[PDB]
Amino acid sequence: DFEEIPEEYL
Amino acid sequence: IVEGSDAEIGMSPWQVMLFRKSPQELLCGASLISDRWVLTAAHCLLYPPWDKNFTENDLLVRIGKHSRTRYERNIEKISMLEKIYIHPRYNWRENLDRDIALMKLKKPVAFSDYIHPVCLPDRETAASLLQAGYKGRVTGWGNLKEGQPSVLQVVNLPIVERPVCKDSTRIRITDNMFCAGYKPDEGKRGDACEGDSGGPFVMKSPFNNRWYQMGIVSWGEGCDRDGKYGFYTHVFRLKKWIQKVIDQFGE
Amino acid sequence: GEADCGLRPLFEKKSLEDKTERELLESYI
Ligand SMILES: N[C@@H](Cc1ccccc1)[C@H](O)CNS(=O)(=O)c1ccc2ccccc2c1
Numbered sequence: 651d652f653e654e655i656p657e658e659y660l
Numbered sequence: 661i662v663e664g665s666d667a668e669i670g671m672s673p674w675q676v677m678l679f680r681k682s683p684q685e686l687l688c689g690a691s692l693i694s695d696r697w698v699l700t701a702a703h704c705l706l707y708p709p710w711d712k713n714f715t716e717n718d719l720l721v722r723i724g725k726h727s728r729t730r731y732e733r734n735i736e737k738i739s740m741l742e743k744i745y746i747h748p749r750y751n752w753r754e755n756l757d758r759d760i761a762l763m764k765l766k767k768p769v770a771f772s773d774y775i776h777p778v779c780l781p782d783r784e785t786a787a788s789l790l791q792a793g794y795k796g797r798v799t800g801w802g803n804l805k806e807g808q809p810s811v812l813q814v815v816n817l818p819i820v821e822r823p824v825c826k827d828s829t830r831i832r833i834t835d836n837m838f839c840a841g842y843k844p845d846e847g848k849r850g851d852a853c854e855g856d857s858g859g860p861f862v863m864k865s866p867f868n869n870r871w872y873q874m875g876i877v878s879w880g881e882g883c884d885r886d887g888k889y890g891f892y893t894h895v896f897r898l899k900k901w902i903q904k905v906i907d908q909f910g911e
Numbered sequence: 912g913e914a915d916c917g918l919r920p921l922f923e924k925k926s927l928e929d930k931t932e933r934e935l936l937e938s939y940i
């Protein structure tokens with residue numbers, strides 16, 4: 651449901 | 661927020677979203693009180709009866725947001741947590757007494773038109789503004805009904821008399837809580853709802869024109885029910901614990 | 912309290928009012 655956030659944050 | 665409206669842009673620049681890494685989802689709201697400290701509700705992090713117990717690495721904070729679900733390129737800043745502190749006398753067994761927690765971010769977030777800290781009150785600000793009938797403001801991306809908002813939502817709600825709060829519920833109310841909301845007679849409506857917890861109840865001082873965080877969205881029994889009110893952590897009553905945490909562990 | 916706390920860049924800082932803050936002020940009798 652949420653837009654994918656940059657993977658640098660994950 | 662139930663019966664609120666869309667926020668304007670940069671209207672709540674201290675609003676923080678607590679966001680779960682995996683699955684990717686909104687956990688709660690929160691507020692920015694300085695460039696490295698975010699304030700939220702303890703139950704957003706720890707609530708054992710629902711098997712809730714997040715550590716730092718489960719969580720991210722997202723600051724500068726307006727859209728709920730969009731990744732707001734060049735506007736928002738996503739931050740990792742260094743350490744979480746939950747009030748040592750937070751009462752999750754009984755009544756959510758002392759529903760407060762601090763999160764320290766790994767690096768300073770840069771302020772912008774969309775990112776700016778809220779004030780914490782002093783004794784005089786609290787004594788002056790925390791009065792039955794005086795209105796504050798609640799913001800969040802939580803449910804629109806007891807479905808979900810495209811953008812940050814806002815509602816202004818009056819502080820309610822201590823007896824009325826207590827007479828609305830079977831839960832034991834402490835001096836570390838206040839309730840706010842319209843009465844059934846009052847005609848108007850509105851409430852925090854699921855997903856709004858941790859977020860700020862703020863007031864604008866008529867004395868220095870500054871926004872102060874008077875409450876933290878804590879709990880209710882349903883959302884926007886007639887004869888029922890939203891309960892908020894009383895921020896000033898817990899300010900020494902706040903100052904202590906920040907002074908001991910901050911830089 | 913932080914020096915510049917609680918003053919919003921797109922409102923207080925430019926002396927703009929938001930749509931409903933007057934409701935708050937009117938409540939502070
Ligand atoms: N949005 C939630 C907030 C919440 C979640 C989990 C734990 C506490 C609070 C609802 O307001 C919860 N509503 S509730 O389930 O009726 C409730 C209300 C008061 C409570 C007081 C102490 C402990 C649990 C509570 C649950």
Ligand code: NA
Pocket residue numbers: 841842851884885886887888889890
């Ligand atoms: Na109500």
